[PDB]
């Protein structure tokens, strides 16, 4: 019988952020309301003077310390100070790691206490491009810079989604990641993602984690991009077509597995798999996306290294497709986010979709048919791993969205 808070505000974007500072803004009660009471201000003139003095003598550690002591809930650093700390120190390629440590703590404190908005952001896409693409610069602070960027984007998206009931014209994502307006940026981030995945290091360790984290961050940016506009469907289609060719030419398999596994936007993975499957099938299919379509691909698909590995790969692709299909059906991702909020608050139920009218007999017959086809084209006994994978697909289909 405890007075739970208004948990509804947490359902809007359940996907993982980098940090959970949002827990400090849940309470819509006396504590937070009275804390916000005072009107904010900038760093006092004299304090500003001393901190700039600290800047002058090229003693970055003193600057970070003094800023840490001065930043408080009733004051914020002027934008110039934020730009200085980020560009001058964080991405400086000379100092030691501890300086980057303190810088990260400083930025995190600023972001935790003051929610950055569009009119106050520091970095620009040009700087991101410089740090990422312009190789020949191995900046130790690159990972932290990317983490800060993604955290800023996520915070801004959440705040704008909460505040604005009929628009999103004042969000960082809107003006730095909208596919309609800056599609070249989307292309560049996809290129960076495929580059990072392709970066060797796996064959038959510390930097592997770096690539993994940056890849997760890029996937987060893609996921937010897929929602920034009003209609997820068109943006997802655009993104899927731009990434189809890039995913096509990935040399090895494990890279493709990492690419698909890390996928965050469920609709994006669904579209990518659907497009590749259709491109890999001789006879096109006009049936919309549904379980019937899953069986359609299962039957009429082919291979686009002994072939059993390829068939294994297709099995995994179909399981991914079924998982993402279930997720989209249950989450109602098709609608916009702004009205999806009202949908989830009202807790309206989904509805059956055309092409989902199948029975257990159908799936059993289809699975037996595929088993026969695989034996015919390869023989028996199948590889034990392949056996396990087909068995797993059998159970997943038997799920059959049994209603």
């Amino acid at each position: 019988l405890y007075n739970r808070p208004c948990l509804h505000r947490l359902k809007y974007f359940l996907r993982p952020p980098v940090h959970h500072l949002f827990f400090q803004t849940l309470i819509p009660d006396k504590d937070t309301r009275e804390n916000k009471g005072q009107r904010l201000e900038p760093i006092p003139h004299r304090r500003l003077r001393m901190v700039t003095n600290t800047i002058e003598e090229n003693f970055p550690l003193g600057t970070v310390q003094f800023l840490m002591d001065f930043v408080s809930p009733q004051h914020y650093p002027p934008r110039e100070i934020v730009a200085h700390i980020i560009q001058k120190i964080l991405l400086s390629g000379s100092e030691t790691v501890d300086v980057l440590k303190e810088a990260y703590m400083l930025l995190m404190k600023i972001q935790q206490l003051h929610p950055a908005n569009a009119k106050t952001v520091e970095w620009d896409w040009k700087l991101l491009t410089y740090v990422m693409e312009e190789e020949g610069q191995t900046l130790p602070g690159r990972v932290l810079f990317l983490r800060y960027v993604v955290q800023t984007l996520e915070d801004d998206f959440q705040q704008t989604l909460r505040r604005q009931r009929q628009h999103l014209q004042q969000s960082i994502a809107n003006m730095v990641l909208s596919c309609d307006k800056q599609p070249h940026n989307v292309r560049d981030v996809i290129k960076w993602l495929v580059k990072a995945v392709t970066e060797d290091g796996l064959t038959q360790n510390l930097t592997k984690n770096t690539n993994q984290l940056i890849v997760c961050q890029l996937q987060r940016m893609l996921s937010i991009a897929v929602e920034v506009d009003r209609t997820p469907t068109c943006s997802s289609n655009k993104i899927a077509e731009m990434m189809f060719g890039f995913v096509l030419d990935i040399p090895e398999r494990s890279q493709r597995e990492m690419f698909f596994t890390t996928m965050e936007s469920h609709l994006l993975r669904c579209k990518v798999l659907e497009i590749i499957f259709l491109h890999s099938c001789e006879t096109p299919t006009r049936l919309p996306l549904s379980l019937a379509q899953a069986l359609y691909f299962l039957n009429n698909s082919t291979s686009l290294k002994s072939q059993w590995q390829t068939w294994d790969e297709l099995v995994e692709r179909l399981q991914f497709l079924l998982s993402s299909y279930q997720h989209v059906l249950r989450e109602h991702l098709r609608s916009s986010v702004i009205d999806r909020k009202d949908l989830i608050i009202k807790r309206i139920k989904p509805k059956p979709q055309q092409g989902d009218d199948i029975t257990v007999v159908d799936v059993e017959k289809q699975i037996e048919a595929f088993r026969s086809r695989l034996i015919q084209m390869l023989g028996e006994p199948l590889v034990p791993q392949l056996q396990d994978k087909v068995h797993l697909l059998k159970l997943l289909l038997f799920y059959a969205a049994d209603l």
Partner: protein, 419 residues
């Protein structure tokens, strides 16, 4: 370096003893055992072993748990996996699944059974599996948990229905990712269900978290979520004023090296009232301890700080340590080299003390008469500290301490003139 700028740290984790309970080759949700009637459970118990991880990562449980509470052992095994899995992406995905299922259930779980949150037994289990000793988890004999190590080990092992394989460490290097997910989940549960823990439990959690932070190989990894969880826990306690001094003494008692104590003073958050209270009280306790002052139930703070400053005269402490070492040393003869070494030690100690004075002095409420105290305070720094400091170009540590005193003087002067 005569004065290193960061706490040295210490070896808390031991790799060769990391993972004595369970690993990823031992946890399966099949062994939990439930009446299989829904397609969810039937599929799970008919599913293989790797299909288990596949189902977890791709949100199959989240898909299958939109209107039904997830059984508690399922969440417990998910927590275990998040804690023990080596790969980073799988661990992050498992944590995401845990957050999603917990939030959804809570939004639909109005039943008296509150959302599952790892009891101290669970967190102790995971951390000990990581390679933290019981005393390391709880190093204050005065405050100890409600159980013992053997109970935890036997219960967790028997629940996990093994010398067969030569025990390799589950992690040959700091499991940063797993620790981060564990603390993130802890913060989530603390923030969603505040009254889920008891005051004593909260205190034990604070003690173990602070002790863990002192890890040697964790110096380079920013512990922001540590601060977030600290904020939540400090906010959770119900008898605050009464509980503050006990906690302060507890943190004081964790270790001996003063720079580590300075670290823990710095690490606590300082943008919430209770955080500031903790900071100032902990600083008072530390300054009382280090100066060899008898713990006689420590405006009067003005005279107490003046007394301290008198005691922190570098020459005075130098001679005090000279006396102590001469008594300890069977001969009692100190060479110029060892004299200079003790000089470094005394300068280090004074550096730490001036830092603590800087932290304690900060305050937001002041009466007019407080001016005089500050006027005296700076004077003492100028008189009881600055004058005895003689600049020597070849000796940089003197310059460091002098500049530190200069910064303190500047801040105090600015505060004074603010009126």
């Amino acid at each position: 370096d005569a004065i290193p700028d960061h706490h040295p740290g210490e070896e808390i984790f031991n790799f060769l003893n990391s993972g004595k309970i369970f690993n990823q080759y031992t946890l399966d949700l099949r062994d939990s055992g439930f009446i299989g009637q829904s397609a969810v459970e039937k599929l799970i118990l008919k599913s293989g072993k790797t299909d288990q991880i596949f189902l977890t990562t791709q949100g199959f449980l989240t898909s299958a748990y939109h209107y039904v509470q997830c059984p508690v052992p399922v969440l417990k095994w998910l927590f275990r996996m998040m804690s023990v899995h080596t790969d980073c992406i799988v661990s992050v995905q498992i944590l995401s699944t845990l957050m999603e299922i917990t939030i959804r259930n809570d939004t639909f779980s109005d039943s008296p059974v509150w959302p599952w949150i790892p009891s101290l037994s669970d967190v102790a289990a995971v951390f000990f599996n990581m390679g933290i000793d019981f005393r390391s988890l709880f190093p204050l004999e005065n405050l100890q948990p409600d159980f013992n190590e053997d109970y935890l080990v036997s219960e967790t092992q028997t629940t996990s229905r093994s010398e067969d394989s030569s025990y390799k460490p589950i992690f040959s290097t700091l499991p940063e990712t797993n620790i981060l997910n564990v603390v993130k989940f802890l913060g989530l549960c603390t923030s969603i269900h505040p009254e889920g823990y008891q005051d004593r439990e909260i205190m034990l959690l604070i003690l173990m978290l602070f002790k863990m932070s002192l890890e040697k190989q964790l110096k380079q990894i920013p512990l922001v979520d540590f601060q977030s969880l600290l904020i939540n826990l400090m906010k959770n306690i119900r008898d605050w004023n009464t509980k503050v001094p006990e906690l302060c003494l507890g943190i004081n008692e964790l270790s001996s090296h003063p720079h580590n104590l300075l670290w823990l003073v710095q690490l606590v958050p300082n943008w919430t009232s209770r955080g500031r209270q903790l900071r100032q009280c902990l600083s008072l306790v530390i300054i009382s301890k280090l100066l060899d002052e008898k713990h006689e139930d420590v405006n009067l703070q003005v005279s107490v700080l003046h007394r301290y400053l008198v005691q922190m005269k570098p020459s005075d402490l130098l001679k005090k340590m000279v006396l102590k070492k001469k008594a300890e040393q069977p001969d009692g003869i100190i060479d110029d080299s060892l004299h200079l070494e003790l000089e470094k030690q005394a300068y280090y100690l004074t550096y730490i003390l001036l830092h603590l004075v800087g932290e304690v002095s900060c305050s937001h409420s002041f009466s007019s008469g407080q001016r005089k105290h500050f006027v005296l305070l700076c004077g003492a720094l100028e008189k009881h500290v600055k004058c005895d400091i003689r600049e020597d170009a070849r000796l940089f540590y003197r310059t460091k301490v002098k500049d530190l005193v200069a910064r303190i003087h500047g801040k105090w002067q600015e505060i004074i003139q603010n009126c």
